């Protein structure tokens, strides 16, 4: 094997809203922004006391997964945290969450960038050097020219292995900026050293490292050979000032975290790191730059939109610029693009093929897109009923343990305090719709999986293939269906299921 998708069975984990990483379960007097649609807000005004607002998370733990498949899932809407690959339910969560991607060519120009670049260039180079005539707009040229003629500043690229000065800088930054005191080396290794990717991507070849370090000197027309995650360190007079942790994807570069020395707040290393990453993308032959998830309301995450980008649309797998949909996404409410040509009688047919899974979509600029979120996911939304008869049909015929629920389980009440909800709700945006799944079953498309799908039993401590779909126990069928719903038929085509009833 070289690229088998080996993970655990996805499960729905719920935690109280106070543990929210951005709102902490509160946003002030704007109770509407806690919800996703105003209709549910008006519905639950009477039930504000018994509303069990949580921080919805869906995901699973990964053991081994290829970098290209990671790119596919990152374009789908997932980014991993440590070794935990997950994404939130857009509808039932507490805070909104989208993925943004940026191109190096479409950067805007502001006075702050000019000032910071000028200060950095003045600092690193010698005072006797005369600056060239290259315009400040060409930031890549400015950065390269500044780095060519400096002796006190240099950066290096190394794998993600553990060290001691890195941990010292990490704890210094923690206790100085976030007042986190219980940091431990094991916690640091878990946070920034666990790697689902294989060792080949982790350690790489020395020639690849040489090319990555010589990135300022690569002529266009060559291919960047290295793949996987890397760490970038910013030396200055022989001592560390910052650490950049990121990864190299075939379609771009993503960012996860950043640590800098507290005493060097003068240089404002965050913006400099972002600009240097953009310069790396431009000088290299990569094309995009995934900044992470995007949250609108939260003031801590708003800075990511300064560079300008396009926020992902979960229900269509398309990328659209933020400018046309600014009013649509204002105040943090879920949206789905739509046109007057097509009605909303049934759910959106998510094309479960390569043409519609984590790849770009050239939109029709003639039509004026309009919000249809309240049409398909509103009080009179047709999703709930269709889900109901679909679940009834699957349970009646194929025996999959699907069950029906009343048209109010969008936000469960205090009754779920007795039993923690572990199942994936039927009504969830950006997922495979139930009726399409029923079409897959009834058309015999499920007959493709058998012969090359692998199911691992912890009880037997062995790996077994899928021979007959219908002969499996009902729980196995439920888990397989959930995986196919969450990640896709093509993804499950070349995956390995670590299924166990021991848990
Ligand atoms: Zn929240």
Author numbering: 1 to 503
Provide the authors' original text about this structure.
Arginyl-tRNA-protein transferase 1 (ATE1) is a 58 kDa aminoacyl transferase that is conserved among nearly all eukaryotes. With the aid of a transfer RNA (tRNA) cofactor, ATE1 covalently adds arginine (arginylation) to its protein substrates to promote their degradation. The reaction requires arginyl-tRNAArg as the arginine donor, and ATE1 catalyzes the specific transfer of arginine to the first residue (Asp or Glu) of substrates. Here, we report two structures of ATE1 from Saccharomyces cerevisiae (scATE1) in apo form and in complex with tRNAArg.
